[PDB]
Amino acid sequence: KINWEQVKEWDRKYLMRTFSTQNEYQPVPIESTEGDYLIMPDGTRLLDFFNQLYCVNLGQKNQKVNAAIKEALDRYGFVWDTYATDYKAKAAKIIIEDILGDEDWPGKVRFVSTGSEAVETALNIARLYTNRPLVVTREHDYHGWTGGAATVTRLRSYRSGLVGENSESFSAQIPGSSYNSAVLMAPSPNMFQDSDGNLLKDENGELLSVKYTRRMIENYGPEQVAAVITEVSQGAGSAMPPYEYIPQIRKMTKELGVLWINDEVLTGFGRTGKWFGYQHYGVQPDIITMGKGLSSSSLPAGAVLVSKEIAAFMDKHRWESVSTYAGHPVAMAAVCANLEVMMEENFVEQAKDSGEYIRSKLELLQEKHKSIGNFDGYGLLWIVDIVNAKTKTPYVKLDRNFTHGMNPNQIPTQIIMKKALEKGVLIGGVMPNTMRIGASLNVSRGDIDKAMDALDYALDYLESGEWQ
Amino acid sequence: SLTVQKINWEQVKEWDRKYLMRTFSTQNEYQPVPIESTEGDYLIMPDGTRLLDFFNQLYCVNLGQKNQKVNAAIKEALDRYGFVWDTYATDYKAKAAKIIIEDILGDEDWPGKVRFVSTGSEAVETALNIARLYTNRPLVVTREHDYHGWTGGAATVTRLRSYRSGLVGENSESFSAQIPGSSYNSAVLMAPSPNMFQDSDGNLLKDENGELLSVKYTRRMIENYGPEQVAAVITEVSQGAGSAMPPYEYIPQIRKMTKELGVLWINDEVLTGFGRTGKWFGYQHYGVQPDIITMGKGLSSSSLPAGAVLVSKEIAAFMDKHRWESVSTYAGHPVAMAAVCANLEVMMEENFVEQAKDSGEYIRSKLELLQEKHKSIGNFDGYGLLWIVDIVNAKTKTPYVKLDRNFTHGMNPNQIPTQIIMKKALEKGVLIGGVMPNTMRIGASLNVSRGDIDKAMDALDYALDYLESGEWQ
Amino acid sequence: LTVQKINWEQVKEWDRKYLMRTFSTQNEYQPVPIESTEGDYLIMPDGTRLLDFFNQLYCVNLGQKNQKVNAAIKEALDRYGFVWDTYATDYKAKAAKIIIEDILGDEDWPGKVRFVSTGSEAVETALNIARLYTNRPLVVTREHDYHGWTGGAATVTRLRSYRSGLVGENSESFSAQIPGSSYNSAVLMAPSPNMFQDSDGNLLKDENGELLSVKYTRRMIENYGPEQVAAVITEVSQGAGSAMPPYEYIPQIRKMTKELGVLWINDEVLTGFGRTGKWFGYQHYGVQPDIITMGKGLSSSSLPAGAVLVSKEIAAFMDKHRWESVSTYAGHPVAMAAVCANLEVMMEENFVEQAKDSGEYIRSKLELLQEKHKSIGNFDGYGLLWIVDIVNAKTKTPYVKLDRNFTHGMNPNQIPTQIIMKKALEKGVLIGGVMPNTMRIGASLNVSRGDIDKAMDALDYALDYLESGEW
Amino acid sequence: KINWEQVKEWDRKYLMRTFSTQNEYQPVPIESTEGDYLIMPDGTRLLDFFNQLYCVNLGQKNQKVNAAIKEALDRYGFVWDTYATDYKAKAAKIIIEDILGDEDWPGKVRFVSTGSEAVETALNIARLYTNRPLVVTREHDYHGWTGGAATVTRLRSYRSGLVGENSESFSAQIPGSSYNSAVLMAPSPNMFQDSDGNLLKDENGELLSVKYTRRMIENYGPEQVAAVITEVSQGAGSAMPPYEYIPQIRKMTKELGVLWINDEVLTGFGRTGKWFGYQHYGVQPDIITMGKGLSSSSLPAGAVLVSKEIAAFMDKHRWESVSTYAGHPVAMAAVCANLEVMMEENFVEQAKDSGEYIRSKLELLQEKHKSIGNFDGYGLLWIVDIVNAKTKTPYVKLDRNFTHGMNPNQIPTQIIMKKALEKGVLIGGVMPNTMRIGASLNVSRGDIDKAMDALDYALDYLESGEWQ
Ligand SMILES: Cc1ncc(COP(=O)(O)O)c(/C=N/[C@H](C)c2ccccc2)c1O
Ligand SMILES: Cc1ncc(COP(=O)(O)O)c(/C=N/[C@H](C)c2ccccc2)c1O
Numbered sequence A, D: 001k002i003n004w005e006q007v008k009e010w011d012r013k014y015l016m017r018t019f020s021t022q023n024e025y026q027p028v029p030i031e032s033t034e035g036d037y038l039i040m041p042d043g044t045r046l047l048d049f050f051n052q053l054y055c056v057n058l059g060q061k062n063q064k065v066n067a068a069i070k071e072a073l074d075r076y077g078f079v080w081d082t083y084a085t086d087y088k089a090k091a092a093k094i095i096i097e098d099i100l101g102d103e104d105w106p107g108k109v110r111f112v113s114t115g116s117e118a119v120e121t122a123l124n125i126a127r128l129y130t131n132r133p134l135v136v137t138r139e140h141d142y143h144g145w146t147g148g149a150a151t152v153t154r155l156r157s158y159r160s161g162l163v164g165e166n167s168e169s170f171s172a173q174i175p176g177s178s179y180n181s182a183v184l185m186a187p188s189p190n191m192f193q194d195s196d197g198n199l200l201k202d203e204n205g206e207l208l209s210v211k212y213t214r215r216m217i218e219n220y221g222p223e224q225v226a227a228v229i230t231e232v233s234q235g236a237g238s239a240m241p242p243y244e245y246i247p248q249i250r251k252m253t254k255e256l257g258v259l260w261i262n263d264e265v266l267t268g269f270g271r272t273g274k275w276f277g278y279q280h281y282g283v284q285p286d287i288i289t290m291g292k293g294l295s296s297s298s299l300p301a302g303a304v305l306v307s308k309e310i311a312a313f314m315d316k317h318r319w320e321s322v323s324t325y326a327g328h329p330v331a332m333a334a335v336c337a338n339l340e341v342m343m344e345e346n347f348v349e350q351a352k353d354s355g356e357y358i359r360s361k362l363e364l365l366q367e368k369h370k371s372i373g374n375f376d377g378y379g380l381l382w383i384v385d386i387v388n389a390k391t392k393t394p395y396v397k398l399d400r401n402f403t404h405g406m407n408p409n410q411i412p413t414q415i416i417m418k419k420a421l422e423k424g425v426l427i428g429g430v431m432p433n434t435m436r437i438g439a440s441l442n443v444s445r446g447d448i449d450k451a452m453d454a455l456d457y458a459l460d461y462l463e464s465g466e467w468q
Numbered sequence B: 001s002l003t004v005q006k007i008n009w010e011q012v013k014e015w016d017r018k019y020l021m022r023t024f025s026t027q028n029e030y031q032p033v034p035i036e037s038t039e040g041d042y043l044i045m046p047d048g049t050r051l052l053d054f055f056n057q058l059y060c061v062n063l064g065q066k067n068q069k070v071n072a073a074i075k076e077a078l079d080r081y082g083f084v085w086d087t088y089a090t091d092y093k094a095k096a097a098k099i100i101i102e103d104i105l106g107d108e109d110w111p112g113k114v115r116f117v118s119t120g121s122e123a124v125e126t127a128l129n130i131a132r133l134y135t136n137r138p139l140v141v142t143r144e145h146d147y148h149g150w151t152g153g154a155a156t157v158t159r160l161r162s163y164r165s166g167l168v169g170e171n172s173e174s175f176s177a178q179i180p181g182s183s184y185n186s187a188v189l190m191a192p193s194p195n196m197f198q199d200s201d202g203n204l205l206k207d208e209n210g211e212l213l214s215v216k217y218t219r220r221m222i223e224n225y226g227p228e229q230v231a232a233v234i235t236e237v238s239q240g241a242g243s244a245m246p247p248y249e250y251i252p253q254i255r256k257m258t259k260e261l262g263v264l265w266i267n268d269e270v271l272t273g274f275g276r277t278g279k280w281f282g283y284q285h286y287g288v289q290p291d292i293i294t295m296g297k298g299l300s301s302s303s304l305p306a307g308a309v310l311v312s313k314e315i316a317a318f319m320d321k322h323r324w325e326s327v328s329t330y331a332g333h334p335v336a337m338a339a340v341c342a343n344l345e346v347m348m349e350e351n352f353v354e355q356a357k358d359s360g361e362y363i364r365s366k367l368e369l370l371q372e373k374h375k376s377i378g379n380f381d382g383y384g385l386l387w388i389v390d391i392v393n394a395k396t397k398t399p400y401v402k403l404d405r406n407f408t409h410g411m412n413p414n415q416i417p418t419q420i421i422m423k424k425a426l427e428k429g430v431l432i433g434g435v436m437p438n439t440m441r442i443g444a445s446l447n448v449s450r451g452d453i454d455k456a457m458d459a460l461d462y463a464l465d466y467l468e469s470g471e472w473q
Numbered sequence C: 001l002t003v004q005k006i007n008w009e010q011v012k013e014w015d016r017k018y019l020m021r022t023f024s025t026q027n028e029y030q031p032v033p034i035e036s037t038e039g040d041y042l043i044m045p046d047g048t049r050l051l052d053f054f055n056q057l058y059c060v061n062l063g064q065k066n067q068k069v070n071a072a073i074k075e076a077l078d079r080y081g082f083v084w085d086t087y088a089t090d091y092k093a094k095a096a097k098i099i100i101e102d103i104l105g106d107e108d109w110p111g112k113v114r115f116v117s118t119g120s121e122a123v124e125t126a127l128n129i130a131r132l133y134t135n136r137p138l139v140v141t142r143e144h145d146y147h148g149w150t151g152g153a154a155t156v157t158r159l160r161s162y163r164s165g166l167v168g169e170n171s172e173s174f175s176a177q178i179p180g181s182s183y184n185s186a187v188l189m190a191p192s193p194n195m196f197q198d199s200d201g202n203l204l205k206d207e208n209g210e211l212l213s214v215k216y217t218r219r220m221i222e223n224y225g226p227e228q229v230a231a232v233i234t235e236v237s238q239g240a241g242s243a244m245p246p247y248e249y250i251p252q253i254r255k256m257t258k259e260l261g262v263l264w265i266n267d268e269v270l271t272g273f274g275r276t277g278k279w280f281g282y283q284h285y286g287v288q289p290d291i292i293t294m295g296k297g298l299s300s301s302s303l304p305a306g307a308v309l310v311s312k313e314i315a316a317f318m319d320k321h322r323w324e325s326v327s328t329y330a331g332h333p334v335a336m337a338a339v340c341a342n343l344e345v346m347m348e349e350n351f352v353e354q355a356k357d358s359g360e361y362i363r364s365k366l367e368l369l370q371e372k373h374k375s376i377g378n379f380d381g382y383g384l385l386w387i388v389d390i391v392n393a394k395t396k397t398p399y400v401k402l403d404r405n406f407t408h409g410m411n412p413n414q415i416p417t418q419i420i421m422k423k424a425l426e427k428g429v430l431i432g433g434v435m436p437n438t439m440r441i442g443a444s445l446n447v448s449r450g451d452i453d454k455a456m457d458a459l460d461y462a463l464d465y466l467e468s469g470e471w
């Protein structure tokens, strides 16, 4: 028995708010979950096409994973990273030998507890390996929230600052942490189109975004730039780059003697219909960061995978870094089971298939809806650009530079979400003009149809314009 | 089943060698130490060796290893969840905050609201962000030898040289590599350790007003940089990794000084929290209340990853007025929250804080006797299940390792008294030692038995005999 | 009956032994002694005369050793002496009155001046005031900007070869930036105005007509938050960085900063005081900044002086507070006497109009040279400040690939502008550039036509040699 | 003939204020100067026992210096540092061979225009030579105002920020430049004593301030620390260290492999009754910075002098640093003449002997004035600790951590100055409770008598309470 009224009371009173003021806050109790559904205390079932934070890849409450965690609990317990366990050794083995067995770059893994911790770790390693301070990120990148990971996060609305309630006159950024000179922000891969939608390139055929990034590094001195960090599809920032961007980044970094870190926290583990996002582009990074789909959120886990050469350098020294819960044996038991089910049940192929299906459904919805400017993606990770049906331009001018000071009733993705909710579906986005769609890798055709139907409905209401 | 070997530990050790990044050891020197299972205060190796753990891992398995009520409660949560992020409400998350504020701290007026995260470093990151936003000021004051975590923001307030995630050599003190760029934009002042400013006797020095000199110098730094730009002073009441106990007056004088200067006080309870010192929280020994505390470790007794920040009513009311653009995927994870609830309920139900207090008294008497028989014991101090023992050369009464708490792990461990002690004690099946070269850091579960305390103190006696025999040099 | 006896060989020996080197290693260094100067000429101790078409550092605007300025300095020395900024003198108040009332009397923005000793000091001052006025930390500069060498001014300098680091001798292997230089720097590097051009030379614009350089600048400010950006700092023509912007860039920057609520600092240390054929470089663009910085032509290097001029609204804000800033030599009365005399001579003899007229002359001279020499890819400028783009005559592309991102680790014998300089020297003319593919030409504002002909002649000769390829 | 009423109008209207609001500002015109006097337009003569900013060492408007400047002006003109001149070369030879000919450490000079520029240069050189980022300064040190020099200035009231008019309700530090992570502030040399005023030494005899400084360097890693920067007597900060502090800093820096930069901008060129302040302590630095007394403020000049080994390192590279007016030949002529007159007329011994006279005058004043807690100094650089006689403690509690937001009618050194001005004497200090006394090195005994007489008068008034 649960007194859910008392839960709501304690939630309001004793928990710090995020994204909502206390004044506007309404708690949203979830009593249990299963597959692609959340279940409220009263039995209301919600089809979650956010997959929480694109991070419950295997599906909610997988029985094999939960069984594996219970088995681990018969033995552990807790030991820290200095001690060896079967679960932690095996989890690293599955990643390097089984998932990445066909690639030569993978060297060694360090496990930590969250994606931000994985990014912090990758930044530290890249800087130690190169003995260089600067890291290049991109406009709209999101790489986590802790002090080091936030420095390479250039998504204005997600930098742990304060904004007002339906007022944009109240921006407060964290003092002493609102900019960092050890990071250079390169432009979005998406910023160099001409008025016809064609890509701008230099005389050598290099995308202008890449060429600009190259010039920034030359100007600061390649001898002081450790790495470029990317997302192959910007997650929170909600954008897909030109196909040639990632290959050209790989090339450019090799030529300049600079490491490439690809952040796979969100794109990893089948999200994009391949094992990793980078594998769509025929190149291999120096370092990747992992979270989310690593355990499909069953328990907190993050990881960094470094190349053979980076691993060999680190092996030669005593590294003075300790994180209490890094390698936690029960979280590692969850990771092993998560990955074993993903492999065994061919979840990556499932995602590719469901993605091809989703593309079809979006082709149909676009023909039917003028507020869809474009859509793109793969697997269970899609963007849909929303535009004013009349003007063919976005409703919110600041777009990906907006802040949460805005009134949600003026935000197209907030409007869409609220309408789709009437149909028992959670679907929308985090950017004002852009849908961010994702479900479990094994989402059913039936649930995809249900989601797309609710979206059809929300888009009718949006294009009616009676919300304005 | 006909299966008689679930795990191939030989295979595990090869994977561990090959595929896992090393910490504190080079690959060349590394020797894996596999642990197949744990229970109470014991670690069990796959060959059956049982080790009595008087490190309690990292002073963090407060309830004891593999508590059956906690593990049962985790299994029950797995019937319902699943995963939801912080935007959604659950019974476990809400109850965990309620237990902390209403139940454990029900006799105190300052507590306002909790944010749950996944680790102690994430809790410190959160506390720094909130202190800076609340005051609208950039600077944070820390102390020499403080350890507050390893992530970029938490590391800025960590001033323990050997724990800042840099690289050192294999038995060579001449190859330090710090992380390039790690202080680009750090807004932190290092104030002195409470413990510096000592007599020849050992008195901690005060001015004419009776203000400790460590506190007076901290006041002067904040004045100099301008109190209007200092968001907070962050402390540990007993430095954990740094291995130090302050003079009794230090923490009360810090509270008074911060109030007078209009500066926040963050006390980091990640290690001292949840009965570790024989009160619920370390700050409670000192008759003062902080503005913010950070938590981890004993918050869940490491059963699953959890960290938390608790801010005052004042601070919570301020944050409540704004939309806070901060998201952490696993913050408030419902299964981790289930573990925190059960951990705290057991801790309350069974009076673990009183158990720790009593065992600490019993440890004090054991340590008094060891001191009477070993001149290598300079002094000792502590409470509950958290103890320091200063080790000295019995002949000179000066520490063996001159750099002391400013050492690095580039040193050869065969020269480090706490490594010597530890290696010897292991012959008795006991893990006991410390992280600083001249200072033991001793801790066990809050419910450790008298028999295990005796066993660990016996092992220590034996190790000290060996250290004092000088044969190791 | 008294000789000013100087042992010049001893001078050279002391110079080698006792003075720190810049730009040259000790081993490759050869001292070049200058005994006196006059107009546009440097005189060596043996009497050799060198026509200086660098005007040293584009900074001796009035001409070398102007008799009127030097007499006015001698006159001030009858009274001073030294007093610091807390005390008032005629020379210091008059210098400020001349700038505000007599030179910029046709504009309404000017409020108050603070005098300092150098252009880097003036830039340090401008950064401090902009940040204090807006109560905001970030300043936006551009790729290849040069704003000075001191700690604050260097943060907004993004010219790689001029950031007081170390490079090797004819090796790009060993090189060192100053450790710890960026700990705390609150600076964003925006694109240079020239960054987005097509193969015809047209600078690219978005739909409504905004230059892409400006558009990305605005996007960076939006992303970091306009509420924390104090200012954008510019040069209207990049000095050391050797570049001219498209006409619309500066008006667009003025427009964008007004729209975003951000200050515009224009750095006039090099382009100021007649250098571009108008009193100040920004005056070619029909806009007015919030703050400018001054040096060089401010005193025509007669004595060290720099200055910052701030708008009326900024001045009114500063006036309401006690500002805790002291510089020992700020306002030095004898330096202020030099500034007053330099500016009075400049106004009374119409040096600005002379500069405009001579620029039109130089323009005509460079057209002829470009017709005769294919290694001239393009040229641009005004008054006595010219860039000439030097290219391979056959490809019409630059020889040195790193271009404005080069370092002084390069061998000078591979640098086109070094080659041109070396050749022109045979003719007793100093002319060339600081960037590898780009001439940077300047003389005194009152330079004579005959001297212009003589410099252009030397360049004719140099370019012949460049275009034979023998080097 | 000058219209001083109009000068005063232009000064009010067109010049930026420092230390005063426009509201409270009263211009103080000075028409000419000579020796130790400033002469107002109406002929009023003021005896200047601040020597402006402790910087007109030779005396005001020395005729031999002024004649040398006029001669230079018959030749120059301007040439930058790439060209050699007799004045610039000779200035360098005068410093290294003539003034410092008895010492082995001096290598090479770089001339710049100001003391802050000199400090900026030294910071850059120390960091380049060691290839390390951190520089240790001390609480209350003043090393200049420009961006790099300000990072090592830890004198609160002199960091170019804003304060209010007789109030605390406004106050603003320069955003983005109010603290720096590349500097560590070590304690002031008089850190703590015991109640009796005994110095605290450890078992190795090391003063607590030095031992603490040592621990900071160990903590941050000696391999990361380029230099310790000092003033042998804090100039603006107004303090004299224990005799043994400086020797022990020299020893500690040598042991740790760290450079020692001593800032001689104020203590340099006879100010302390020796050629340089450091020379009272029997040790030699690695780098010194110079200004003020370098030209006795006749024209703007500063300089850095680096050791032979630092000079040999720098000589091996191409240094990409330019400062337009560095080495200005007319400023260099002034420097030459200044140093020649000092040498030829034994200004250093004049300073030493006058300091001994000042000492006996202050001794007599202290017998008669219980508001004098203590005094110390040498040459023409003195501090006097002012206290409330009836409490034996300073009147202004924040002391050297005060700000200029305070009312000057509550500041003892302001009271003293205002009163002393009735006798045509300028004397006082810049810290609230501490006089800072200096005149030209060739100041006459008659002028010392006249200044000390006016101080005696000022202290009668202070002690009377009538100001309160
Ligand atoms: C590419 C990437 N890297 C690192 C992290 C940081 O991982 P964490 O949270 O510390 O475990 C994240 C998390 N993003 C958040 C939760 C998100 C995702 C989508 C929309 C809005 C927000 C990420 O996407
Ligand atoms: C006061 C304090 N705060 C924060 C953290 C950071 O917590 P985390 O690891 O991110 O969950 C810790 C952890 N310390 C480490 C693991 C330690 C303890 C003793 C000896 C050596 C190392 C801590 O002691």
Ligand SMILES: Cc1ncc(COP(=O)(O)O)c(/C=N/[C@H](C)c2ccccc2)c1O
Pocket (backbone or CB within 6 Å): C057, C058, C118, C119, C120, C121, C123, C146, C147, C148, C149, C235, C239, C240, C267, C268, C269, C270, C271, C295, C296, C434, D322, D323, D324, D325
């Ligand atoms: C736009 C600008 N701002 C500030 C300063 C800094 O003034 P300063 O030197 O401190 O008096 C300068 C100086 N430039 C140097 C001397 C230069 C010029 C041309 C080529 C190479 C270098 C400048 O051009």
Ligand SMILES: Cc1ncc(COP(=O)(O)O)c(/C=N/[C@H](C)c2ccccc2)c1O
Pocket (backbone or CB within 6 Å): C326, C327, C328, C329, D053, D054, D114, D115, D116, D117, D119, D142, D143, D144, D145, D231, D235, D236, D263, D264, D265, D266, D267, D291, D292, D430
């Ligand atoms: C030790 C020292 N170093 C560097 C400088 C910086 O020299 P500058 O001004 O850039 O030529 C100074 C200047 N001090 C100021 C002007 C002062 C002195 C006494 C009281 C109050 C203020 C200094 O004392």
